[PDB]
Amino acid sequence: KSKLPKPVQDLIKMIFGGDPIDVNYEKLKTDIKVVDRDSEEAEIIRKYVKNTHATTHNAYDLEVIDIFKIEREGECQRYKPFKQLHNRRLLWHGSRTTNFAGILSQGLRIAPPEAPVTGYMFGKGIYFADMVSKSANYCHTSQGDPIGLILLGEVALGNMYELKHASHISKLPKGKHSVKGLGKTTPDPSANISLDGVDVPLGTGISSGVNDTSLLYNEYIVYDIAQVNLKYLLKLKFNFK
Ligand SMILES: COC(=O)c1cnc(N2CCN(C(=O)c3ccc(-c4nc5cccc(C(N)=O)c5[nH]4)cc3)CC2)nc1
Numbered sequence: 279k280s281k282l283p284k285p286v287q288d289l290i291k292m293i294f295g296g297d298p299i300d301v302n303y304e305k306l307k308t309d310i311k312v313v314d315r316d317s318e319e320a321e322i323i324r325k326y327v328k329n330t331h332a333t334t335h336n337a338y339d340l341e342v343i344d345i346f347k348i349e350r351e352g353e354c355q356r357y358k359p360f361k362q363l364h365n366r367r368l369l370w371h372g373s374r375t376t377n378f379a380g381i382l383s384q385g386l387r388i389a390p391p392e393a394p395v396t397g398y399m400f401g402k403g404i405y406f407a408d409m410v411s412k413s414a415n416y417c418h419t420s421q422g423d424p425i426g427l428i429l430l431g432e433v434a435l436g437n438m439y440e441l442k443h444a445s446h447i448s449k450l451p452k453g454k455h456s457v458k459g460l461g462k463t464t465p466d467p468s469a470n471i472s473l474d475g476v477d478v479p480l481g482t483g484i485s486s487g488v489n490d491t492s493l494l495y496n497e498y499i500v501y502d503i504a505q506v507n508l509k510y511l512l513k514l515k516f517n518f519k
């Protein structure tokens with residue numbers, strides 16, 4: 279007899295793959311609410327998904343199954359220093375389903391100091407995209423179980439260190455709060471809207487006019503866990519072609 283709505287129950291079953299559903303819910307230390315399918319929030323999120331699928335990520339199309347509003351215990355209190363920092367953006371973060379119990383209970387985390395920098399294009403930090411398909415690739419979704427989880431997070435970017443090439447270090451110059459990896463393609467900035475004082479870059483991909491960058495698409499990195507406030511969790515269907 280769980281009192282949770284069916285979509286939340288199915289999300290819990292997916293994350294934990296056991297204890298009663300309500301016992302597993304309490305382990306996430308996260309308020310989870312279903313966003314109404316006919317709400318303005320849902321419409322904005324579906325537009326963000328539709329508009330920001332990269333043309334080079336054509337292995338699958340995405341369909342939104344369920345949208346959840348999430349509030350991790352203590353996370354808004356932790357974010358207070360960054361809350362009116364200029365340049366807050368609603369950005370994607372994808373991950374394996376098997377990581378989501380950890381992400382909801384502990385939040386997005388940075389690799390420990392001992393960890394090697396190998397493969398971290400912009401060093402040990404928390405990585406986000408403005409193109410849903412770039413983040414969806416980090417779900418590692420299989421044809422055999424074509425359902426993935428992706429976050430939308432409010433990221434306090436402040437003053438961005440704009441880079442066109444990999445730098446494997448995690449230390450920013452004084453007064454810089456984030457790295458923007460400059461892609462060849464960017465959501466049309468003339469379609470950017472604000473949702474609760476946060477920029478949502480849900481424009482269709484156009485050419486950035488940046489030349490001599492190694493990135494097809496933007497990415498955004500912060501180096502302090504307190505610069506992230508997770509807002510939504512989407513369950514997506516991957517329709518492979
Ligand atoms: C064996 O040595 C190697 O050759 C080697 C090579 N690579 C490695 N490693 C590869 C990099 N390592 C990471 O954990 C790591 C994982 C994910 C990203 C990442 N980038 C994103 C950009 C936009 C959005 C998202 C998103 N999730 O929405 C992004 N996520 C970045 C880094 C560490 C492990 N380790 C070792």
Ligand SMILES: OC[C@H]1O[C@@](CO)(O[C@H]2O[C@H](CO)[C@@H](O)[C@H](O)[C@H]2O)[C@@H](O)[C@@H]1O
Nearest residue numbers: 450451452453454455456500501502505
């Ligand atoms: O501020 C949060 C976070 O940003 C870093 C850079 O990753 O430092 C920036 O912000 C500091 C406090 O506002 C400034 O003192 C600093 O100049 C600036 O680079 C991290 O050190 C910090 O945890």
